[PDB]
Amino acid sequence: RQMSFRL
Amino acid sequence: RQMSFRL
Amino acid sequence: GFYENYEPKEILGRGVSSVVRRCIHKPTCKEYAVKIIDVTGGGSFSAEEVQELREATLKEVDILRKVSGHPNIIQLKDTYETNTFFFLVFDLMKKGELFDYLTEKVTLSEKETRKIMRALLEVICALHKLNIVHRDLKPENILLDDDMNIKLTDFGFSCQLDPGEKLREVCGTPSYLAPEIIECSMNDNHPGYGKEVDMWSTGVIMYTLLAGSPPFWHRKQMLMLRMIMSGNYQFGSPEWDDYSDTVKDLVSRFLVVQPQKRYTAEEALAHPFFQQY
Amino acid sequence: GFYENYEPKEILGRGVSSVVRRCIHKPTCKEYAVKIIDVTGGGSFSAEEVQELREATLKEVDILRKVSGHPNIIQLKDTYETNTFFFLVFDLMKKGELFDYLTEKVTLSEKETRKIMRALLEVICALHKLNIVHRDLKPENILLDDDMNIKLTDFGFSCQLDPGEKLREVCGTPSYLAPEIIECSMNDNHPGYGKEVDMWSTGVIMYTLLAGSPPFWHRKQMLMLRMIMSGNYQFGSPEWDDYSDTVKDLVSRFLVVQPQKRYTAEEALAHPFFQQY
Ligand SMILES: Nc1ncnc2c1ncn2[C@@H]1O[C@H](COP(=O)(O)OP(=O)(O)OP(=O)(O)O)[C@@H](O)[C@H]1O
Ligand SMILES: Nc1ncnc2c1ncn2[C@@H]1O[C@H](COP(=O)(O)OP(=O)(O)OP(=O)(O)O)[C@@H](O)[C@H]1O
Ligand SMILES: [Mn+2]
Ligand SMILES: [Mn+2]
Ligand SMILES: [Mn+2]
Ligand SMILES: [Mn+2]
């Protein structure tokens, strides 16, 4: 699965 | 959750 | 507050800073879904960090209240706040997400794909009329009800833009990211990005339904990002053979690198795939 | 092949290129866990891409066979291959992962943390004696059995290094990434990285058990990466108050930016936290 991110 | 990745 | 009105059940889902559980409303005995958001950063963040997360959460709730009422968007019923947690109570969707559905059926048909995309584009068209960008479109954030109708959720990265405003941050889910957000991270003299990132992601969703896998899927992340940046993808081997040329034309209008040439929701709903004469 | 010997059940987990399900062995009626890996890339990848994924999978199986026998590592029972899929049959772990456990208990005690870390360091020490790097240490990849003993799994990014060899690729899970792998991606004239990345990740795991959240947890990914690169973290507010100074000393020896000064598994097992005199 894939989660969201913030740089 | 967090998945693995390849650049 | 929240524990005096509701009873907590099992984990339905998990996020970076949140846990989603099934819960019973004490008074009415009805079942709901509750997103528990930790603004304190698991154990501990800084005061600055905490305020950034508390302000991101309040904007999420704000958009949820503005878009309330649409039949294909999730409904926020009740919110609660403390010093460390935020509680957002939603309608429970028993058949889960479009990601779980796709996993069981492997691929979907052209006809079943037309159903879902016609609904999804309608929602996107509505949001973009209000100047709102979702900014995290993907199968895991599209839920299904008992009649199998789509319900859009997770407005955690969403924004209502001001006249003239452009976004500059790099956020989303890696394999659905538009090329303008990735371009933003390599050049600090870039103009920004806008509502068009949602259409690229829509295109990634549509290709993934039909083929069984994402258009820019690669083992090494560095090359995946170079592939998305150049728009290197294909309708290969035996997989896309059964499908018409009209679906393929529609997917390729979404997967366009230059945002000014990319299709909009209004234009996509006018295409021959959904009908033309 | 695989469907003539085993019966497929529910989804226990999901990966980027894999689905993990519960399955019954037809002959013996016993239950196992099966990782279904798609080398074809969901619907379709290129031949080059497919061969890269088929060669990554065979190395995974290889390491699994080499480390077989250790009591705190998962056991691979049987493998199957076709043109599009790979099937890897493992022992079923009913109590799931350390990530699910942590979610239910929120934080763990100093005594319960000493239990898990003593076991985990023992496994790491074993692997590093053979020159093998795991390269994806995290709570979701550590399973628990009925007696609550840890069982290490997911050797998808693992490597047995040759005398002198160094790795150059950027891979892992974002919040557990060592700073040398991130350094590798910004400078193409960097020397590489080695076994030391596993110790950083071990440190992130240990802090996350005790505090409830990861040391470098931030909303914007760009700043998270700058924070990990500089080693900016802290044992803040009320959270770490109950804990001794010995645990904190051990965690800070793992969270060291310069890899040559970072603790090893052998050194960590000699620390006063696990005993000294
Ligand atoms: N209303 C709901 N009814 C049933 N299940 C739900 C509901 N809302 C959320 N879930 C489930 O929980 C998951 C997480 O919710 P959500 O997407 O809002 O979390 P998040 O922390 O923002 O995740 P992400 O990593 O995408 O940012 C979803 O993927 C979905 O499976
Ligand atoms: N032997 C097992 N018994 C029970 N559950 C298991 C077993 N093996 C795996 N699972 C579950 O399935 C999940 C996925 O397995 P795995 O970590 O090997 O997949 P992956 O595709 O390599 O994931 P990742 O994104 O970390 O790379 C795990 O997080 C775990 O919850
Ligand atoms: Mn989500
Ligand atoms: Mn989200
Ligand atoms: Mn894993
Ligand atoms: Mn893996």
Side-chain angles (χ1 to χ4, degrees):
Chain A
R1 236 218 222 191
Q2 278 203 3
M3 320 229 148
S4 62
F5 65 96
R6 298 278 221 176
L7 264 214
Chain B
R1 236 218 222 191
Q2 278 203 3
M3 320 229 148
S4 62
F5 65 96
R6 298 278 221 176
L7 264 214
Chain C
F2 168 83
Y3 293 112
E4 192 72 359
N5 262 316
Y6 296 84
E7 175 190 359
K9 309 320 292 180
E10 2 95 35
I11 300 184
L12 312 169
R14 205 140 178 177
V16 215
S17 52
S18 102
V19 183
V20 169
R21 291 184 189 268
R22 193 194 128 229
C23 59
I24 309 305
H25 187 228
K26 258 118 136 140
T28 63
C29 266
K30 285 157 148 217
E31 2 192 50
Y32 299 97
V34 59
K35 198 169 174 195
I36 305 173
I37 294 161
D38 192 336
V39 296
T40 244
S44 174
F45 277 168
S46 71
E48 229 172 36
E49 281 182 335
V50 161
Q51 283 315 295
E52 293 145 10
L53 185 42
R54 176 200 148 241
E55 287 191 351
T57 306
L58 300 158
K59 187 202 218 187
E60 180 168 2
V61 175
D62 186 63
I63 302 296
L64 277 163
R65 291 180 179 150
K66 291 175 166 164
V67 300
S68 221
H70 195 287
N72 295 303
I73 291 165
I74 190 64
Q75 186 121 65
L76 181 79
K77 307 314 291 298
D78 192 17
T79 49
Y80 298 86
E81 193 187 349
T82 48
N83 265 190
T84 66
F85 292 104
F86 266 94
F87 299 81
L88 324 187
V89 182
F90 301 93
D91 276 323
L92 167 77
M93 295 308 135
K94 305 258 213 355
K95 318 243 115 78
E97 340 146 329
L98 197 63
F99 184 79
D100 293 327
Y101 192 44
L102 179 51
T103 226
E104 250 153 66
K105 295 222 152 145
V106 190
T107 76
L108 304 184
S109 65
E110 176 152 345
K111 271 138 139 293
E112 226 195 330
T113 302
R114 192 165 39 231
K115 202 251 153 308
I116 294 166
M117 298 308 297
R118 202 193 292 270
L120 177 65
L121 284 154
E122 273 163 356
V123 170
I124 303 157
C125 192
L127 304 172
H128 290 185
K129 268 181 213 247
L130 287 169
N131 250 26
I132 288 149
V133 213
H134 187 280
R135 206 153 65 149
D136 198 16
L137 291 172
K138 66 171 183 204
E140 301 101 312
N141 286 348
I142 303 159
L143 310 155
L144 315 161
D145 65 19
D146 315 309
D147 271 57
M148 296 290 305
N149 300 286
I150 77 152
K151 280 272 183 307
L152 191 55
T153 198
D154 191 355
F155 287 72
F157 287 168
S158 277
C159 277
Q160 186 174 55
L161 303 165
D162 281 345
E165 186 191 346
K166 295 189 257 171
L167 305 161
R168 268 174 198 279
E169 347 153 25
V170 185
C171 49
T173 312
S175 94
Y176 295 86
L177 281 187
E180 319 88 270
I181 303 170
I182 300 163
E183 250 299 70
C184 253
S185 167
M186 11 213 285
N187 182 14
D188 284 3
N189 289 315
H190 255 291
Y193 60 81
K195 268 138 56 182
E196 304 82 3
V197 298
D198 275 348
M199 304 319 299
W200 178 274
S201 294
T202 287
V204 176
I205 294 156
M206 189 163 187
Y207 183 116
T208 299
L209 292 186
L210 287 155
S213 71
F216 312 90
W217 195 204
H218 303 289
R219 183 155 169 222
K220 293 180 164 134
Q221 220 168 323
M222 243 5 257
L223 167 76
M224 173 193 278
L225 296 180
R226 290 171 161 154
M227 290 306 264
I228 199 175
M229 282 319 260
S230 72
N232 199 351
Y233 81 94
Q234 77 167 353
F235 306 97
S237 332
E239 286 81 23
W240 290 79
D241 294 347
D242 288 333
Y243 302 135
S244 85
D245 203 354
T246 317
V247 234
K248 294 199 212 114
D249 185 85
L250 186 66
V251 198
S252 48
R253 313 275 172 193
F254 287 137
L255 309 184
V256 166
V257 187
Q258 198 64 7
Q260 313 92 19
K261 299 234 71 229
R262 198 178 299 147
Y263 249 33
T264 63
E266 224 176 11
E267 296 176 325
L269 290 153
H271 195 274
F273 177 67
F274 296 112
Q275 275 336 340
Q276 230 203 322
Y277 62 103
Chain D
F2 168 83
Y3 293 112
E4 192 72 359
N5 262 316
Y6 296 84
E7 175 190 359
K9 309 320 292 180
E10 2 95 35
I11 300 184
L12 312 169
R14 205 140 178 177
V16 215
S17 52
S18 102
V19 183
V20 169
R21 291 184 189 268
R22 193 194 128 229
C23 59
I24 309 306
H25 187 228
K26 258 118 136 140
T28 63
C29 266
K30 285 157 148 217
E31 2 192 50
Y32 299 97
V34 59
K35 198 169 174 195
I36 305 173
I37 294 161
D38 192 336
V39 296
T40 244
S44 174
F45 277 168
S46 71
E48 229 172 36
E49 281 182 335
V50 161
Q51 283 315 295
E52 293 145 10
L53 185 42
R54 176 200 148 241
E55 287 191 351
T57 306
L58 300 158
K59 187 202 218 187
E60 180 168 2
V61 175
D62 186 63
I63 302 296
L64 277 163
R65 291 180 179 150
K66 291 175 166 164
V67 300
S68 221
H70 195 287
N72 295 303
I73 291 165
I74 190 64
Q75 186 121 65
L76 181 79
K77 307 314 291 298
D78 192 17
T79 49
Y80 298 86
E81 193 187 349
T82 48
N83 265 190
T84 66
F85 292 104
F86 266 94
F87 299 81
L88 324 187
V89 182
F90 301 93
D91 276 323
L92 167 77
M93 295 308 135
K94 305 258 213 355
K95 318 243 115 78
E97 340 146 329
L98 197 63
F99 184 79
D100 293 327
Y101 192 44
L102 179 51
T103 226
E104 250 153 66
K105 295 222 152 145
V106 190
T107 76
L108 304 184
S109 65
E110 176 152 345
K111 271 138 139 293
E112 226 195 330
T113 302
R114 192 165 39 231
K115 202 251 153 308
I116 294 166
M117 298 308 297
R118 202 193 292 270
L120 177 65
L121 284 154
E122 273 163 356
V123 170
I124 303 157
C125 192
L127 304 172
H128 290 185
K129 268 181 213 247
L130 287 169
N131 250 26
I132 288 149
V133 213
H134 187 280
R135 206 153 65 149
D136 198 16
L137 291 172
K138 66 171 183 204
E140 301 101 312
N141 286 348
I142 303 159
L143 310 155
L144 315 161
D145 65 19
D146 315 309
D147 271 57
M148 296 290 305
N149 300 286
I150 77 152
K151 280 272 183 307
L152 191 55
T153 198
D154 191 355
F155 287 72
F157 287 168
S158 277
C159 277
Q160 186 174 55
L161 303 165
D162 281 345
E165 186 191 346
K166 295 189 257 171
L167 305 161
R168 268 174 198 279
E169 347 153 25
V170 185
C171 49
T173 312
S175 94
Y176 295 86
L177 281 187
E180 319 88 270
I181 303 170
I182 300 163
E183 250 299 70
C184 253
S185 167
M186 11 213 285
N187 182 14
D188 284 3
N189 288 315
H190 255 291
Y193 60 81
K195 268 138 56 182
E196 304 82 3
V197 298
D198 275 348
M199 304 319 299
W200 178 274
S201 294
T202 287
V204 176
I205 294 156
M206 189 163 187
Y207 183 116
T208 299
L209 292 186
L210 287 155
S213 71
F216 312 90
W217 195 205
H218 303 289
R219 183 155 169 222
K220 293 180 164 134
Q221 220 168 323
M222 243 5 257
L223 167 76
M224 173 193 278
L225 296 180
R226 290 171 161 154
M227 290 306 264
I228 199 175
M229 282 319 260
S230 72
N232 199 351
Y233 81 94
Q234 77 167 353
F235 306 97
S237 332
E239 286 81 23
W240 290 79
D241 294 347
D242 288 333
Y243 302 135
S244 85
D245 203 354
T246 317
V247 234
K248 294 199 212 114
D249 185 85
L250 186 66
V251 198
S252 48
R253 313 275 172 193
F254 287 137
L255 309 184
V256 166
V257 187
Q258 198 64 7
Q260 313 92 19
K261 299 234 71 229
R262 198 178 299 147
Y263 249 33
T264 63
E266 224 176 11
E267 296 176 325
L269 290 153
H271 195 274
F273 177 67
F274 296 112
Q275 275 336 340
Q276 230 203 322
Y277 62 103

